[PDB]
Structures are given as C-alpha cells and as structure tokens.
Amino acid sequence: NHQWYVCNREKLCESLQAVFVQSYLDQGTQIFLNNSIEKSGWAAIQAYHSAVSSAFSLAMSRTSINGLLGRGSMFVFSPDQFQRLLKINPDWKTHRLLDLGAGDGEVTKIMSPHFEEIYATELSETMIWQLQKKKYRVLGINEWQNTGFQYDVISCLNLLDRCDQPLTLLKDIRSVLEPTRGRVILALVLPFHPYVENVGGKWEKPSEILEIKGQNWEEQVNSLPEVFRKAGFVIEAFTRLPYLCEGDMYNDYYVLDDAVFVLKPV
C-alpha cells in the first residue's frame, strides 16, 4: 500500500528532490488490483494458463506464452497518475506516441487516449498480435528511427533492463523525438538487473551496460540523470510506482518497484 510509493527524499539527489512527483494508490490502480484478484479466482482458466505455459515453456519465451494466452497483463500507472506525471489535463492530446517494447499493450492503453496515432515495437510474435488487435501500428526494431518522423511522446516502459542495446535505444530516442515539446516516458525496474530474454527460460547478457550505480531505490535514481544526460535528456518529473501484474493460482498479483521518469530533450 504505502511501501510501493514512498521514497526517502533525503537520500535523493537535490536536483531530483525538486522534480519528484508523489503518486498514491489511486482509483485506477485499484481497478487493476481488484481485476487481478478477480482473475486469480478463475481457477478454470488459471489451470488453463498453467496448462499451456507448462506445455510450451521450452518452445517459446515466457513473454510469448503470456502473449498467446493474453494473460499476465501488467500495470505501471493509472490515467490520473499518468496525467499527473506528464503535467497534462485529462482531455489533453497530441499527435504521435511510440511505446518501445509495449508487450500486450495494456499499459499503452492507459496512454493511448492522448494520441491520434499510436506506434509500438515488440520482439515477441504473440505480443505484436495483441498490439495489432488494439489497432496499434507495429514497427520493426530498426524502422522507427528511420521512418523520418518524430514522435511527440516516446515511452520506453521497462524496456531498458530487457533489451540488448539500452544506451543505443536511448540515443535512438533522442534523434527521433519532437524536440520543441516532445516528452519521453521512461520506466525502469530497480534494482537494475538487466538481461535479454530468450526461448525456454534462458537468457543472455545485454551487449551494452548502463551506468546504474546505486544501492537503495533513491541511490540508483541518483546516478540516472548522468545516464540520461549522456543521451541528451534531463529529468522533468519522476515518481515511484508499483509495477503490477495479473496473478495466478497461488497469488493474486505480482509487484515490482518501478522508477518512472518524464524526460525532455536538452
């Protein structure tokens, strides 16, 4: 409840202390928690999900299994939390959004009302299907920088710790971001423990490593302005949010410690 949202502000960088937004367990977050608790009581399906995943764990990635079944929808922020972090009103709107590594697009759906065109990328074959079902435009991993356009908002929600070239992705974002008013929405699971997901519960270390040196949640965030400054970004606003996901036969929901950042190009 509380431990998902509070940070020791005295242990923060005094530049981050200024731009810290305090979020709370709001109505939109409880809409997710109640549903995840509901879908955990559906033992009929909870054994069906448990059946397919146990069958195809060796043949696909855990993400691709979650995409095929449409299960394990995750949560980062609510629309209110999202509006409060971007310093935007409910009816606010712009042209282009890009969600890098969008998954099944259930977190993109939170942001999607604020945009006229929604682009997204993914490596999982089943996740791309879940995105096209939401009518999003799925682009290749090396096309979104080379189409020519600049996205008014680019969201990299917890893709850094899961991709092979994180710092390259940071650079690629700075190039094709609308420079006058474009914002970047970044989520990142701390403690930062990166890898690249492969098929069958295996993995591989990312080709690039980010300079995330820190010990508590506040200390890892302390070293992040340097990393974002390396990509031409400064922190406009940030917050601590619980990174939730739909539970299972044994648990109702799974929680992680997300540090979410709204950035502007410098």
Partner: peptide, 7 residues
C-alpha cells in the same frame, strides 16, 4: 508458481 510477466 507463475512468474511476474516481466521477470
């Protein structure tokens, strides 16, 4: 028993 979809 079932992972957090992220991992």
């Amino acid at each position: 028993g079932h992972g957090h979809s992220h991992g």
